[PDB]
Amino acid sequence: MIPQTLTNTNLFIDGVSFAGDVPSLTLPKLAVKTEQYRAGGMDAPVSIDMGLEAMEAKFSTNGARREALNFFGLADQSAFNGVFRGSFKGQKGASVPVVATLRGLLKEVDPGDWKAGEKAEFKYAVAVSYYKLEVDGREVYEIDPVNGVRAINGVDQLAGMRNDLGL
Amino acid sequence: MIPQTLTNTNLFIDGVSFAGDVPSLTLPKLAVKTEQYRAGGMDAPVSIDMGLEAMEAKFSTNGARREALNFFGLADQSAFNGVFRGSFKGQKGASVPVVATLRGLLKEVDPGDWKAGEKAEFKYAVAVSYYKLEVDGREVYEIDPVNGVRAINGVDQLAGMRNDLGL
Amino acid sequence: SFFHGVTVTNVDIGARTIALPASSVIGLCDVFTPGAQASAKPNVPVLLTSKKDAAAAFGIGSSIYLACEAIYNRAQAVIVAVGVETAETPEAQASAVIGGISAAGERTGLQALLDGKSRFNAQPRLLVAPGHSAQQAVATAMDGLAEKLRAIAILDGPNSTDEAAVAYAKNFGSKRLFMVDPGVQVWDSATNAARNAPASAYAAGLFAWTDAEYGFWSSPSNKEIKGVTGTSRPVEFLDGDETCRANLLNNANIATIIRDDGYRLWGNRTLSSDSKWAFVTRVRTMDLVMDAILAGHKWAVDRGITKTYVKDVTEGLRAFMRDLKNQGAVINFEVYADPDLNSASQLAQGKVYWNIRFTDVPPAENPNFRVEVTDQWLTEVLDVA
Amino acid sequence: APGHSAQQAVATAMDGLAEKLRAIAILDGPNSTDEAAVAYAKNFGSKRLFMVDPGVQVWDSATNAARNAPASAYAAGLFAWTDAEYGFWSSPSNKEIKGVTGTSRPVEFLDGDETCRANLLNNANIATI
């Protein structure tokens, strides 16, 4: 493998390119809701999957980006749409894109303290519903909570436990 | 977009310009009271809006600004009036103002320690009721708790759930 | 002058006839007499809201209000009703319903139903001319109207024998029409005589009812008609019967009524020639997701094409199509841009394509109950033991 | 020039006025039938004109009647609005007209329709509502 790092970053919200002001993105921390399970005839628990937990996907800007302030606290949850683009350029030339569609509620607009001479750093946060990561255009993650779509590498992981609930 | 940052800062309280002594403002951290909701037929919760939470809007001064000390602990809550002006100048010239009307209770006057040779830093705090942010004069936020005015981008978000309560 | 205080007044009302508010706008066209009560000019449409505007804009005894009370008993819906003047010859009385651009600048007849949009925000997703659809002339020019509006035009056969309406539905393979053969009899508030209503408005108000809480993908087959007595010609459905009148009329792609005193409809299949578009829910979900796809993608119909214009709207189509799969309108889908038909030549003149491939929920037509009386439980049961 | 642009001698001179100023002249067809304004727009191939055919009706402060406004100033106010935040490069088509009710000649846009009143006018290069 070639050494490969993050170099540049972009954010689209309803197609509007934030080519000017995003100093920090943050993808949602994907994690399995681990329940440590020690039972009879064993020890040192085995941590069965119980589904994911909530996925909050922070980012920040430091202008009055009104094209992103108008999504706070709407009556239509999961209507904030936005992708987190970012390219990984490697050492041998070619850049591998990492794009990440979000769809959630802009649940926090945090304006920082205004010390009169520093940056603004409007820290935002979306508690996303939908989440689709791509690597070099190839699909890796689909996370849809409602109607149960958890597809790793394109093949759905919940299909074994979705035709028994009868969804 | 042009790169756009915070440069200067002002505070008015009952029209009285604090052109001398405000070293730090802080807008109220707007946040949705998220209740993470996982139910039958899904996983990885979807975080329904439950309204906002309280909005405390700190700031600081380091003189004995008696024109701001006299608002502490009055019998008339939500009578402290004040705007947080601040201009975002960008790179291509023109400055975008960000003004922010507050209306609340000055619930904390915190004089710092007096180490005899440093600043004073009277940290204040208002647990605001009303909150109106402007960007370049264009309206973005109205937050009024009592009688329920949550208007993002001028259009009221609570009007769908205010003609069913019968307010 | 005016009144103060409280004013009790013995008036002539009765039978509060509540219905759930429907969203699917239907069109309407039937004759009336534009006298002093009817404050509606003849060839122009009016946005109807309830029984009151059906009573104010048209006459009480006029043929519009007798068809508007059919839907407003069943679904509080939105009517785009353009009446016509009563003619003498039925060749011209049928041709008054078509009309056209035969004014100086304006329109007349059924062709004023295109003015439901851009006057009322009410595009008619159902078309019904009560009584004036037994002719070949109007019903051909309703498929010429419903193909343009992307709507389901409701028709009716005549009051003739059973076979004469079987051979009337052989003149159409029109894949958007919907024919309802038996005419509803109705009481009409102590007139002690059953008036033969044409029963195209009763099936039209049923679709607006089943649109609201069952959804448009739900088949409007088993569901109830309100405000109805035993109809004009008795159509029965006997089980396993080759010659029973309902199954005789289903195989000719004609809706009926089945239960006692004309309770419910019986239509599931439309007046088509492709078996691909046989049901009335494939042709209804074809056209009522593709306005909801547009209702939310009005921004995409003109915009400066950025690099992500192809990519941000294909994640806007998918994120809307998952909300239809959420409420059970479809089964799994796929929406994707074309790699083969989006070139640089099409972007210059503005065109850019996207694929959509969903699938309908098939309705439960024909559940079979294969059965046998068996003496299996006769030795273990009924023993001394 | 609202109202006074259905005449031929003005719209010829509004185009010559717009060529000198390097601007966009807003025109309007006659308020007659759909086959009449198409014959009016065949007088010009002059690449600086913009024709808005249906007559906007406005309420005008409890007149309890809708006046046929010539609908050339409403679309001209639309270009000033879309110049500001969408920029001059934005297509000024899909955007809202405010202060307006049901127009003079009701032009629809049915999809998949060859003879719908919007598309019949767009081939003659005429804006509608």
Indicate if C350 and C306 belong to the same structural domain.
yes
Is residue A34 within 8 Å of A47, Cβ to Cβ? yes
Q: Residues C197, C188: contact at Cβ < 8 Å?
A: no
**D112, C301: Cβ pair inside 8 Å?**
no
Count of C-beta atoms within a 10 Å radius of residue A109:
23
D85 is written with which tokens?
């935040």
3-state secondary structure of A84: strand
Give the residue among C21, C43, C23, C19 at the shortest CA–CA distance from C31: C43
Please enumerate in sequence order all residues whose Cβ is within 8 A of that of A122, keeping only pairs 6 or more positions apart, or say none: A60, A61, A62, A63, A64, A65, A69, A109, A110, A111, A112
- How far apart CA C183 and CA C231 sit, in angstroms, is 6
Q: Do you know the residue count of chain B?
A: 167
Cβ of B44 within 8 Å of Cβ of A116? The answer is: no
Q: State the chains in contact with A (3 or more Cβ–Cβ pairs under 8 Å).
A: B, C
Q: Based on the fold, state whether residues C157 and C62 are members of the same structural domain.
A: yes
Please answer yes or no on whether D116 and C148 come within 8 Å at the CB atom. yes
What number of C-beta contacts closer than 8 Å exist between A and C?
28
Interface test mutation site (partner C, options D108, D116, D119, max chain C beta carbons within 10 A): D108
Do A and B touch, 3+ Cβ pairs within 8 Å? The answer is: yes
Q: Do residues C311 and A15 make contact, with C-beta atoms less than 8 angstroms apart?
A: no
B14 to chain A, closest Cα gap in Å:
21
Task: Decide if C222 is inside a domain.
Answer: yes
Residues C92 and C180 placed together within one structural domain of the fold:
yes
Two tokens, residue A117: 């001479």
Say if the Cβ atoms of A147 and C326 lie within 8 Å: yes
* C174 min Cα distance to partner chain D (Å): 16
Length of chain D: 129
Contact C82, C112 (CB under 8 A): yes
Of C312, C322, C325, the CB nearest to A12: C312
User: Last residue of some domain: C255, C273, C291?
Assistant: C273
Q: Report the run of H or E that residue A113 belongs to, with start and end.
A: strand A113-114
Alpha helix locations (H) across chain C? 51-56, 63-74, 90-98, 136-149, 162-166, 201-212, 245-250, 282-288, 309-326, 344-348
**Domain interval for residue C101:** 13-273
Question: Does residue C208 sit in the same domain as residue C143?
Answer: yes
Number of Cβ within a 10 Å radius of residue B163: 9
DSSP code for C22: P
**Strands B122-135, B24-26: pairing kind:** unpaired
* C292 and C267 part of one domain: no
Residues C213 and C339 in one domain: no
Expressed in Å, this structure's resolution amounts to: 3.8
Considering only alpha carbons, which residue of chain C is nearest residue D92?
C302
DSSP D74: H
Joined tokens for residue A70: 């108008």
C345, C225: one domain: no
Residue with tokens 């006046």: D67
B138 close to B146: Cβ distance less than 8 angstroms: no
Rg (CA), chain C: 25
Residue C196 neighbours by CB under 8 Å, 6+ apart: C159, C183, C184, C185, C232
Side chain identity at residue C174, one-letter code: S
Nearest to C197 by CA among C328, C77, C64, C72: C64
- Give the separation between CA C385 and CA C10, rounded to whole angstroms: 77
* CA–CA gap between residue A165 and residue B14 (Å, rounded): 62
Query: Domain boundary at C273, C289, C319, which?
Result: C273
Tokens 């037509």 sit on residue? C365
User: Is there a contact between C148 and D112 if contact means CB atoms under 8 Å apart?
Assistant: yes
Query: Do C196 and C143 sit in the same domain of this protein?
Result: yes
Contact between residue C233 and residue C165 where contact means Cβ atoms under 8 Å apart: no
Cα torsion through D71, D74, D76, D79, rounded to 10: -140
Asked if B152's CB is within 8 angstroms of A70's CB, the reply is yes
Q: From C244, C273, C302, give the residue that closes a domain.
A: C273
- Closest CB to B1: pick one of A21, A78, A127: A21
- Spell out where C164-285 has E strands: 177-179, 185-186, 195-196
Query: Token pair for residue C9?
Result: 């007044």
Between CA B72 and CA B126 the distance in angstroms is 9
Which residues, including other chains, have CB under 8 Å from residue B155's CB and lie 6 or more apart? none
Number of domains chain C contains: 2
C118 — contact with chain D (CB < 8 Å)? yes
Domain co-membership, C191 together with C317:
no
B40 neighbourhood in chain A, CB within 8 Å:
165
Name the residue facing D129 among C106, C118, C301 (closest C-beta): C118
Residues C172 and C305 in one domain: no
Q: Report the residue from C316, C325, C326 with minimal CB separation from A81.
A: C316
In a domain, C318, yes or no: yes
The approach used to solve this structure was: cryo-EM
Instruction: Please give the Cα distance from B25 to C142 (Å, whole number).
Output: 68
Residue C260 lies inside a defined structural domain of this protein = yes
D45 contacts: CB under 8 Å, gap ≥ 6: none
Specify if C125 maps to a domain: yes
Classify residue C326: in a domain, yes or no.
yes
Write out chain B residues lying below 8 Å of A12, CB-based: none
Phi, psi of C10 (to 5 degrees): -75, 110
Do residue A114 and residue B86 have CB atoms under 8 angstroms apart? Answer: yes
Set of chain A residues whose Cβ sits within 8 Å of the Cβ of B90: 63
Q: How far apart are CA A25 and CA A8, in angstroms?
A: 11
Are A15 and C319 in contact (CB < 8 Å)?
A: no
CA distance B135 to B139: 7
Same domain, C232 and C300: no
C294 touches chain A (CB under 8 A): no
In a domain, C370, yes or no: no
Radius of gyration of chain B (CA): 19
**What are the residues facing A100 on neighbouring strands?**
A133
Residues on A contacting C at a C-beta cutoff of 8 Å: 12, 14-15, 17, 81, 83, 101, 103, 130, 132, 144, 146-147
Contact A12 C326 (CB under 8 A): no
Whether C264 has its CB under 8 Å from any CB of chain D: the answer is: no
Which two three-digit tokens encode residue B43? Answer: 């996983």
Q: Which two tokens stand for residue C338?
A: 């074309």
* Domain presence at residue C317: yes
For residue C117, give the amino acid letter.
K
- Say whether C103 sits in a helix, a strand or coil: coil
Distance from CA of A2 to the nearest CA of C (A): 29
Do C269 and C284 sit in the same domain of this protein?
Answer: no
Task: Supply the DSSP symbol for C183.
Answer: P
C172 is a domain residue = yes
For A33, the 3-state DSSP assignment is coil
User: In C289-364, where does DSSP find H-type helix?
Assistant: 309-326, 344-348
